[PDB]
Design a protein around this ligand. Structure first.
Ligand SMILES: [K+]
Ligand SMILES: [K+]
Ligand SMILES: [K+]
Ligand SMILES: [K+]
Ligand SMILES: [K+]
Ligand SMILES: [Mg+2]
Ligand SMILES: [Mg+2]
Ligand SMILES: [Mg+2]
Ligand SMILES: [Mg+2]
Ligand SMILES: [Mg+2]
Ligand SMILES: [Mg+2]
Ligand SMILES: [Mg+2]
Ligand SMILES: [Mg+2]
Ligand SMILES: [Mg+2]
Ligand SMILES: [Mg+2]
Ligand SMILES: [Mg+2]
Ligand SMILES: [Mg+2]
Ligand SMILES: [Mg+2]
Ligand SMILES: [Mg+2]
Ligand SMILES: [Mg+2]
Ligand SMILES: [Mg+2]
Ligand SMILES: [Mg+2]
Ligand SMILES: [Mg+2]
Ligand SMILES: [Mg+2]
Ligand SMILES: [Mg+2]
Ligand SMILES: [Mg+2]
Ligand SMILES: [Mg+2]
Ligand SMILES: [Zn+2]
Lengths: 55, 118, 110, 119
RNA sequence: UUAAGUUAGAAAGGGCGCACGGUGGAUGCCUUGGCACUAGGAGCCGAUGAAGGACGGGACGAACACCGAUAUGCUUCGGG
RNA sequence: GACCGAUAGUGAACCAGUACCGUGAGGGAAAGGUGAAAAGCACCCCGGAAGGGGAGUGAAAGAGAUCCUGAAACCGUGUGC
RNA sequence: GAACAGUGGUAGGAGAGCGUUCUAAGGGCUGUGAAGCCAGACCGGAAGGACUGGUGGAGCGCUUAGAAGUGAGAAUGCCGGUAUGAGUAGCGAAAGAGGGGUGAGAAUCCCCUCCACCGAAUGCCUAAGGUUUCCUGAGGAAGGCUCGUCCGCUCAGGGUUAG
């Protein structure tokens, strides 16, 4: 099966309506103030839940 | 001497694409389809300059009928009476009175009624 | 006042860079850096370097304050394509477009 | 249920045994998050044997723990460490000998990584 | 307040117009090279080793051009 | 020269009978243009570099080597309806 | 100029014209900005033609006549570019895991450990063929179906010894 007609620019753009990234689930790190992914160790300073991990 | 294609080709094609401004998608962008649509637009516009005259007469007649029936005449009877009374005010003008000066329209209608009641 | 940076002919496909650009367009430079740092995409480190280059220009060349900057323009343009060929079955080759991007960021005071 | 981790039964067993011994020796490893989540139960059940301490328990553990050096100084095996150091540490604690902390995606394949460590 | 009625606005995204870019290499202009001829020359080279090559030669990689272990040149006569 | 002007004119304006293809005979391309002059961007800044932003040079750098012009397709950013 | 009449059209006949390159003769334009290109709401019955602004940076119109490689939308036309399908199919038989290191950057490079696979081979030698791919150091644009600090890749050096 092959396309019977080429897809117009418009139909290509309508299809790509939902082809997007979302903003990360990010929050300010209470330790160092850099943004971190919620529920992950903060990469910048290595803190999680008010404790240093990378000790 | 050799004659390159040169600039004549793009000049001609650009003119067609300029006439295709506002057409949808590829029809304002690509020469071959813009050219077909501009051609088709010519046939339509010729046809529609004739239809326009049919369409406005249809509209005027509708409005004259509406105004006529407010004076207890059908359009048909009104037009018969106006012709008998010798009145040559045309449908464009009658329909204008019907909208803008209905008292004047009613005088013409009353003139028509007079001739019909004879 | 505006500061611009451009990365020309970066080896990443434009469609792929534009996914990430769409996250940061109009954001404050602080937020945009964060977004790029926590967005796991190939384009993120490339766009981060352009964004940081634009901020540096804003500070160094034009004495703008990096705290008050916003991304005012952000776009990806197609660079030149590296054309390659993948061998397929039955002795046929098929083209591969190794596309490149020109990545522009303009920062400006809010 | 339980996870398959993209591996055949035997491969998956081999990998869980490897990771289990790695976490006994090192006390903290980094791995994919889904591996960490599978590893918790398997490791905590080895610590339960260690806490039992009897010979039957030790041989059950010997069927799982790998033959690797946990301490070059003392010539202590992973099994010996499990049954001495780890078991003693967790005498009073009732389960939950491990914790998983999430790190975020690694370059290369976006795999969500995590630290798993003994508590 | 209730009822009945009417009408806005909205944009995930999209369309048209406009503005500004990217890509791409058309067009114009240009000519290092061609094409067709005219006048005149010359119409053969080789065992005294040709035509055409290979390998080499420089202070300095490869390649071109030039040269042949006298190798990026030798002598001589003229020119400058 | 009322011949061509870079898809033309030689296949070949360019290191072309080359590259490449074929066991071989043989087939056989693509590819011209910075600027008058390299004056070919000291120095500073972001970056591992690439690439940029300044500063310089220049008549011009949106002439910076992928360098005269720079159409269209095609790809984007903004937004008046 | 009046009147009267006429003016659908395929094959096709006839006529009148538009535009392109070149030449000749007038005449001109142009660094105070030529051609080309972009834009516009201008003009002509059509082909078409100007004007204004922008870009461009050196050539070009006009008149009359001449000569033609003289006009493209179709040839499953030729060459080039770029789309669509699409962030889709695919990424080419196979066991890895963790710790340490290096580094701008590491699932992918190095080291270590255990695990796993071949074993009339997936080992050792050696033809043909290839021709430097070998070793060392440096490198990361392209090649490598991902990545890359690595490499059969790039750059330097080096390396093949016979009665
Ligand atoms: K040719
Ligand atoms: K102009
Ligand atoms: K065609
Ligand atoms: K066998
Ligand atoms: K290396
Ligand atoms: Mg043509
Ligand atoms: Mg084959
Ligand atoms: Mg089995
Ligand atoms: Mg010519
Ligand atoms: Mg040209
Ligand atoms: Mg040619
Ligand atoms: Mg061959
Ligand atoms: Mg310009
Ligand atoms: Mg010039
Ligand atoms: Mg140019
Ligand atoms: Mg008729
Ligand atoms: Mg001309
Ligand atoms: Mg012709
Ligand atoms: Mg065509
Ligand atoms: Mg997808
Ligand atoms: Mg995918
Ligand atoms: Mg599909
Ligand atoms: Mg699918
Ligand atoms: Mg798939
Ligand atoms: Mg594979
Ligand atoms: Mg080697
Ligand atoms: Mg790669
Ligand atoms: Zn932090």
């Amino acid at each position: 099966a092959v396309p019977f007609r080429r897809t117009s620019k418009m139909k290509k753009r309508l299809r790509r309506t939902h082809f997007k990234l979302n903003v990360p689930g990010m929050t300010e790190c209470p330790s160092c103030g850099e943004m971190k992914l919620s529920h992950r160790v903060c990469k910048a300073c290595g803190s999680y839940n008010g404790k240093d991990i990378n000790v | 001497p050799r004659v390159k294609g040169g600039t004549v080709t793009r000049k001609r094609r650009k003119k067609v694409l300029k006439l295709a401004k506002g057409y949808f998608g590829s029809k304002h962008t690509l020469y071959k389809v813009a050219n077909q649509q501009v051609m088709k637009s010519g046939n339509y516009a010729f046809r529609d300059r004739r239809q326009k005259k049919r369409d406005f007469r249809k509209l005027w007649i509708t409005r004259i009928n509406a105004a006529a029936r407010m004076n207890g005449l059908s359009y048909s009877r009104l037009m018969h009476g106006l012709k008998l009374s010798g009145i040559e005010v045309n449908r464009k003008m009658l329909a204008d009175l019907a909208v803008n000066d209905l008292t004047a329209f009613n005088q013409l209608a009353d003139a028509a009624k007079a001739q019909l009641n004879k | 006042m505006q500061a611009k940076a451009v990365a020309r002919t970066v080896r990443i496909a434009p469609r792929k860079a534009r996914l990430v650009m769409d996250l940061i367009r109009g954001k404050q430079v602080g937020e945009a850096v964060s977004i790029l740092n926590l967005t796991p995409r190939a384009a993120s480190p490339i766009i981060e370097k352009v964004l940081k280059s634009a901020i540096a220009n804003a500070e160094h060349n034009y004495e703008m304050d990096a705290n008050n900057l916003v991304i005012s323009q952000a776009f990806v343009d197609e660079g030149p394509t590296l054309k390659r060929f993948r061998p397929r079955a039955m002795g046929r080759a098929s083209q591969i477009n190794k596309r490149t991007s020109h990545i522009t960021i303009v920062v400006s005071e809010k | 249920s339980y996870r398959k981790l993209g591996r055949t039964s035997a491969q998956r067993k081999a990998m869980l045994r490897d990771l289990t011994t790695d976490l006994i020796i090192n006390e903290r490893i980094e791995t994919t998050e889904t591996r960490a989540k599978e590893l918790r139960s398997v490791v905590e059940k080895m610590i339960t044997l260690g806490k039992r301490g009897d010979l039957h328990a030790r041989r059950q553990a010997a069927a799982y723990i790998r033959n690797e050096v946990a301490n070059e100084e003392n010539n202590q095996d992973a099994l010996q460490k499990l049954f001495s150091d780890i078991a003693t540490r967790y005498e009073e604690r009732q389960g939950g000998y491990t914790r998983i902390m999430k790190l975020g995606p690694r370059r290369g394949d976006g795999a969500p990584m995590a630290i798993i460590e003994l508590v």
